[PDB]
């Protein structure tokens, strides 16, 4: 039971050429694009297990003091997100009590203006108008006193341009049981004493200089250090597991993540507050309040791998034979009207 349809042959006369040309065009597309370029003959994996450990080094001088890594890096646990502080405003010896507010927003002349109103922001309002200075009068509050003044101008820590960052990374593709890290076996204890990362002269040393990371992202240090920002470091593992074990290597990229802040005029940077707590010999308690500007780094990891396997080869190859057989038959029917016309 063949059950094969009948077919009639036609002398070419510039029609048989069209038969072979199209029959050869489609067989080109599968070999050229589906197999050789898109690599449809192998199984892909995109779920990657990763791990990042970081460490920073360097010292600087700021406000008649020396600051080391325990002073300007928060949080200290060496994770993949951390901040480097480049500018601070400091208020010393705050205690609980009553004091006048310092900002221009809280101006009053008599006791009536500020009571239960003006509720957004500000501590608890007592309900009196007092003299902040000779020419200014503001409403009294209850809280930590004295209040801070953040309108003055302070210098930045210029030495932070030379600090170094050390990144240690490990990956694993669970489907193929493949493991590698970014510390290559060619790295010796003597090399790490002097190497620095450079994208073409030394693409594998894990030590990055802070001033260069800002440079590769197209920014300016003297301006980013004064308002703060967020920078990203990306590591990519795109590997073909047929070739060899030592052809799998990482690639680094750099960019700036908080792109809205450059063009905005209502919120241009990045800052936060924190405090340190003390206690006297008596029970009294006081603290120190700091407002900090800085640059936030974070490391992002991605990748995928492929390896030859028999099952996707058969499935895609069968579709190739089906496509040419079906493709011609439909091309025959459309050519019947073309030949009839």
């Amino acid at each position: 039971t063949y059950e094969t349809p009948k077919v009639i042959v036609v002398k070419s006369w510039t029609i048989g050429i069209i038969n072979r040309v199209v029959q050869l065009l489609i067989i080109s597309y599968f070999v050229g694009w589906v197999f050789l370029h898109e690599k449809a003959y192998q199984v892909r994996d995109t779920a990657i297990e990763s791990s990042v450990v970081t460490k920073v080094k360097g010292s600087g001088l700021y406000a008649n003091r020396v600051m080391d890594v325990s002073d300007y890096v928060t949080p200290p646990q060496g994770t993949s997100v951390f901040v480097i502080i480049t500018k601070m405003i400091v208020t010393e010896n705050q205690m609980q009590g009553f004091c006048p507010e310092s900002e221009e927003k809280y101006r009053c002349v008599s006791d009536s203006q500020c009571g239960p109103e003006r509720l957004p922001g500000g501590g608890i309002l007592t309900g009196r108008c007092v003299n902040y200075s000779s020419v200014l009068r503001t409403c009294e509050i209850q809280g930590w006193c004295p209040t801070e003044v953040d309108t003055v101008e302070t210098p930045i820590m210029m030495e932070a341009e030379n600090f170094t960052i050390f990144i240690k990374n490990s990956i694993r593709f669970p489907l193929f049981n493949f493991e590698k890290g970014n510390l290559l076996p060619n790295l010796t204890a003597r090399d790490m004493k002097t190497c620095r990362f450079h994208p073409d002269k030394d693409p594998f040393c894990p030590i990055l200089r802070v001033g260069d990371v800002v440079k590769f992202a197209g920014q300016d240090f003297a301006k980013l250090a004064r308002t703060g920002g967020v920078l990203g470091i990306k590591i990519g593992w795109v590997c073909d597991l047929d070739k060899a074990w030592d052809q799998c290597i990482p690639k680094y990229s750099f960019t700036r993540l908080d792109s809205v802040s450059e063009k905005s005029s209502v919120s241009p940077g990045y800052n936060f507050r924190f405090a340190k707590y003390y206690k006297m010999e008596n029970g009294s308690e006081y603290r120190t309040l700091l407002k900090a500007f800085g640059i936030r780094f974070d490391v992002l990891v991605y990748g995928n791998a492929g390896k030859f396997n028999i099952i996707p080869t058969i499935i895609s190859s069968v579709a190739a034979f089906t496509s040419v057989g079906v493709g011609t038959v439909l091309c025959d029917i459309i050519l019947l009207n073309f030949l009839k016309g």
Copy 2:
């Protein structure tokens, strides 16, 4: 050499109508579902690069003291996960030494009951029984003394309902080099001074009120503040790049994430311990231990975008043409067997 197979024509309009109806049905399905609704003529992109910066404001009174953002928020770095503390239990001036244990599950009547048997809790057992009070007798430990009492009832900080959260977000689609943030160009300082988020009256102000978030999640503040919980805030960027640049818009949603806690009866909330360390003029050291209940927020960002292209259009058009031809040929034999 076209080599077209022979074709037989059935003059019956009774079958011609069915042939035409089926062909129109198939072409209708392709032109309506694959193209217009599913938008198969454009290239998708789902890998989004994001960034979140937050800040909190407000003051309240608790235990005859005024507390502010450096007191009730932890960790202080302004990331996308943070906690607001609404209730505390405080133990003052702990030092190292020997003391009895306060809990009733450590009851004893002689030196023999508690030895190396029960390992955890407090510190290291010493092997003696001592009077905790006039009616209770637990057995002694070594560690920070005195131990904390956990069963008393403390009030919550009611003013935490009015605190405000400010969220700043930025995205980028690397395939199309598209960048936008949730601070629209219409925003000004005067608007910043008074706006508040509302899903229909003001859907774009970045300032959120805590009570409103708890309300939108469908919860009750007087219970969430007493047991603790986890709430989620979601921002979605689903926009089409063929239209104008000023119609890619964020959408906000709210929900509660630790849904098992309210059902369960063995662990109903969220709490933790932390301490503060001091030192005397002499070398001696002491500390203050705190157990804190609170609400945890975290911001989640997702999205995808598409843009018209040529290659998917060509592929889908060729698929439609070949499906028309193949669908006809099989239906030809189908009616050939039927009739």
Copy 3:
């Protein structure tokens, strides 16, 4: 206006059995692989919403002191990632001033050797050279003094083997509106009082012991606690929503994540520094510096679910009928060449 092709039937004994066998094989492949093993008749969902809360308990002796959870666990907010400290090196009462260095990499003979040219990350090199001991001479710096000594040997805290970890997890599949947690409805306080996890004797108690986790990962505590490392805990929710509600359960797995460290000789572990700040009755400020080695745990959640629907069923059935119809038509042309040959 209907159309049909013409069919030729040849009742060859071999051809009939061949085409029936091939058609049966195609039907078998569709009914066995596509609809049964692969479950093509249902809709998938892989976006999962999760939440994790942890808590640790235990006490131990270390350097004539008793330590508890507020001392050995950082950070303290009970999130997915945390560290347990097993070894420390402590420097007491550091203050600002001038002092000589301690590391052997800073030796002198005369003042001219170490100046601005040698940048070692030292806070500053005042430019002199001073006696450190009776047989060593390094050159002076400015910063927190005295500097720390890093090469001595310290014991590890062995009681950390018996600490316990409590994990509370909640998931939700938004598509099907499905919610469940890892605290099963038949868990009581009395069971909570004494249960421990065991992969076959008790697979649902959420209390894990640290030594058991280290063993399941395939490691050795006596040296993991001495160098440091990173371990992973995985929870997987893979369940079918056609069955009963109480058949969706979690599965636990354990592994080590920083696999590059054990095979390397330039960076074998995981450590970091942090500090505690004090100040006297005067303004004088001093601190205590600690270098910590530990084990970092982190919890990873994943899963997917499926549920019966009608649209994928219709699509797959139509595809199966078309492939059967196309398969017969295509093969017979191919079989004609076999029949002709």
